[model samples]
Target: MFKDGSLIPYLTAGDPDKQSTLNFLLALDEYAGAIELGIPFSDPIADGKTIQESHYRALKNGFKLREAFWIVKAFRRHSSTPIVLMTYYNPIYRAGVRNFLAEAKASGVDGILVVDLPVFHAKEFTEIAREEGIKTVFLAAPNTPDERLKVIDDMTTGFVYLVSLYGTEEIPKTAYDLLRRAKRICRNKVAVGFGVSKREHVVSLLKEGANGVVVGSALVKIIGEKGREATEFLKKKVEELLGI
Candidate 1:
């Protein structure tokens, strides 16, 4: 539910390498409406098995929160496409929330997505983000109670991240019908993600009335397997698939 279209590519901040990540960002900028830059954490509870595997490789290769900020800063220097920082709360808490938000805004990040924080508990971050003119996105799970979902919908800005399934890991054919119902209720743009790789998923989301689709594992896998060519292939495929 962004400005337009229905594809949002997800990439770990430093999967293969910083330079490769930058290339992928630049390439995808032409096709994607927005970019979700994942901060590789030592423990990513919400991440699926494939994403976890990719995170391991990224960490082993030296990815961290500091580097993630640097990468965001680097990307900002070149482009102004909306950049959302998708990360866990622990790192932000450890780094000092105010300081993190300050640096993130200074680096030109457009939004922040803290995967583990419940909406009620996200006030501190959201307030800080708002002060810096950065959007604070919140997530709604398939099983979330309607009352809670209302709070989530109210709190989320820029967009609402609807986890398309019930669990932490991604599974095939896990689209939750409740999400479509929720989409109908939401006033803001709703973006569906989790195990959403194939082009059919994007089309299905559109048909189901979603505003956007967040494609993560597939993009990171392609980069891991094809390196630089991954960026090239994604540039063409993302545009072609999304009909950009």
Candidate 2:
């Protein structure tokens, strides 16, 4: 999770290949303010087009959690950039609470964002993560009731991820009001995601007091379409949005 006004570019762990993934991450360190690395899972229900497509390609190429861990560990050997592991609940459950935290810490992962794992279910996991100095990122939505928002804010460690829209589908526009309301409700940094694919979106998010923007599909699309060139393109895209 980010502190404030950060640009987080999301990518699948083994989309093209481990080598390409490493190169992509290096590029992001140069181009992005932060990075979100998705550990490819067989079932990723919450993922949208770009992610789902990347997952499909990685699976077809025989990618899994173990391989994803290797990638993170390898990346950590050199860079100290904040790495957030994005995945579904089942894999974490299978890894068991203690083992997962230990492995993540050893791999130099900074945070965890398990989709479908709500705050209440995350109590023990959060404890283990905190014990290991890992941030547990929780999500808030436009539809999340205010009382629940406060609960999430208290439960989360580093920042609160605010889903900008109602569903996983892409909307041409970002819902800044959702971010504004979440900023008002949650005390921690707020990262806005979903349909935040371009520079204007990031600028608008920062202008409205959002702490960060999560760009996923757009980055994946660039990778899918342009391969190694995606790195340069993504950096340019982030710079374009930030007006840097």
Candidate 3:
């Protein structure tokens, strides 16, 4: 389960290589409350260049849902950190929702977050996911309406991902306002993602009531630059972000 001030890190599965990807998860599990493992797609629209490139690198190396599951199942043996698969809906739809959710559950995936699926349209997907006992996490942006925020809260079994920034830029001043409103509106555990990569950002978001802070690009950038060599640096960065 997500903890207060929980550190959530996202990584594209099989990025660089499967062994290194598994290594990163093992190292991060020691510190993170949960981890988001992206199922690499040809088009990672919500992601910036850093994450998109990670998806590309992994996909080019023949990564797929099967490989992602293998890594998660492997990670499950070493740690109990909740693993949430953040993916586009198309893959799951193509795989058949019922089977996909069951596969994820059997593979030790604790949750599934389909980034492009609208909550209202995900009734069947969510229903099957619930039956499988796999948590579904939804997104909440700064511009989300009060009614919609409540709907998303109701949809998610795990934490709601509060998109801290609008795009690929750094966290703006209004992210604080968004987090404030999301905390007020969402009865579910609320987390902030999209632009979290710093000690101060993590500190501020947690201070403002973020149940978890999700870091992706910052760590992904290093993984891109150094490949397997990034292990220590990634751990240090996360430790600093947690103010450990």
Candidate 4:
């Protein structure tokens, strides 16, 4: 998504069903620089209400880690938009890291962001991901120290995810500072996310030197509410976010 300063949209795989998820994927591929596909987990610790419920909805629809790979593989047949899986470590472990990475690479996945995996514990998995040609994207929250940011930068291959806020709708001044500092130290692109729900939020992040912006909860909520019209809604929202 960082090819040019970009907008990365997040979606839960099989939110309603695989077919609708694929439709949304194709629609988003036309506009998004990249798509962050969340694999449904029973306990998504990092997610807020919107995304948490999305996980539940997907699970209710029989979403599985294997099915997520199938969705990516299916999407790859038509589009080359970068696909980053946002998941927790338990699923990876359950599927076996080696097996998961192999399938993910075969499915045309470009990167992974394991929210529950910390930098210190990422060495083995990140190494395997690198060997498989999958970028390892790590998160750097606003409270992360400069030294830790440098560590995260070294561990990250795709881009450093700078989480600027929690549940609030507005970006804070500290988030801007955090983004600037992350940019200064991280050689990789710095994409800020968390509580970024509006066009203005994206503009502010871009102005503050974000290499990309990740919009999640708001978009997921739209999909949940709009159902069959999710793809159309997402297309309009993406256009609005891009100011086009």
Candidate 5:
């Protein structure tokens, strides 16, 4: 959905509850190119403390993999905005890759980003996603080599996610270099994330040739702080970022 280079906002499903997630999506759909719905996992190693805590809160509220699908289905009922499920490989393996892909497609999910699933081990999963018409997103980082970037480009269907930083609060200079390299190697859009918490970061990444931006912890922090008022707050925040 980053066809024109756009913004993607992430939210952990069932953090407050399923209904709240639906409300948030409905509120932000008009401004977002796509929505990244994070399914809570027991071990989200790639996530920072904010997202980790979101996972815990979701699980504490009895969130389930099935419920995540239901939330997607509900979202489909109102808007056709693209939805990408951000999850880890463990849940897919537990549900069985085929079963997970089938359910996700049935639920109207457009794409997936498996955090811990390396491109080397993603052959079968990528094949299944292609067959199911579900885009498979892969991650690239500053330290990734050119050869591996080519592999990621070949395996990825939707976009190359450039990790701006790891467990930090700033988008490092190397992230721009990585984005440029990834764009050269990959035919798909290159979106940057991780530690992107402000409007200037988004503007700077776009200026550096990033095709899209994913904002997570900042929006999640808003939800955490605003409670039931998060939808409106998030909408205004996104508008401000978009310069609307």
Candidate 6:
């Protein structure tokens, strides 16, 4: 669903409060091709320390999945920039797969990524999501076999998430290999994530054939330190990264 060189920013919902997330969403709408809103879960499997800290910060205020949906519902007033909820499977399981997706679709969510849910276990989840016209986003790691990668691609209605590594450090060389592999095997648009910090990483990955680059911890750090006031800083950060 993303074009070449699209920038996707990941933000934890309610880092300080729901309003702040909404504000950040607004500031990010124009810049991001899509936004990944992580619902605070006690166990954030794929998240690094920075995102984990943001989750902790958000949960301290009793942030709930419904509230996360509310943040996006509020954001829909000004944007149609795809809002993809990033969460672990339990939240959806507890909320009931179809029910949560129904609520999410009503709240203007275009796609969803369950960080720890494998594609095989997501048959019900994907089917319900497809019925709701919601895209089901799945992750692929560097070590995955080509056969496994193809299933993730076949199951995903949204862009295939290529998780490269942990933290917003320098992009690793091996990540490019996975990106190339994903490009070759997946029919879906492939978006690379993990450790993508600067504009250079975005540029380099795009050069390596990534359709999109996901920036998470790097942007979350600004939200961590500045709260809602990080709006302008976050926008500029994405602008710099995308060089748009």
* Error at 44, model 4, angstroms: 0.6
Tens digit of per-residue lDDT, candidate 1, span 58-109:
8899876788878888888888888898988888888888888888888888
Backbone clashes (count) for model 1: 2
What C-alpha lDDT, on a 0 to 100 scale, does residue 152 get in candidate 1? Answer: 78
State the lDDT at 206 in candidate 1: 75
Q: Pick out the ten consecutive residues of candidate 6 with the lowest summed lDDT.
A: 164-173
lDDT of 4 at 77: 93
Candidate 4, residues 159-198, lDDT tens digits: the string is 8888754566677878887887887898888877766767
Which residue runs does candidate 2 get wrong by more than 4 Å? 1-3, 118-120, 165-174
TM-scores vs. true structure, each candidate: 0.90, 0.90, 0.95, 0.94, 0.94, 0.95
Tens digits of lDDT, candidate 6, 47-142: 778888999999997797799888988888888888889999888888788888888999999999988885466787788889988998998887
Count of clashing pairs, candidate 3: 0
Model 3: what TM-score? 0.95
Relative to the unseen true structure, what is the C-alpha lDDT of residue 209 in candidate 3, on a scale of 0 to 100? 90
Instruction: Report, for every candidate in turn, its global Cα lDDT versus the true structure.
Output: 0.76, 0.76, 0.85, 0.84, 0.84, 0.85
RMSD of each: 2.7, 2.5, 1.6, 1.5, 1.7, 1.5
Model 5, global lDDT: 0.84
Q: Give the TM-score of candidate 2.
A: 0.90
Q: After superposition, which runs of candidate 1 have C-alpha atoms over 4 Å from their true positions? A: 118-120, 165-176
- Model 6 accuracy (lDDT, Cα): 0.85
Alpha-carbon error at 123 in model 4, in Å?
A: 1.4
Q: In model 3, where is the ten-residue run with the lowest total lDDT?
A: 164-173
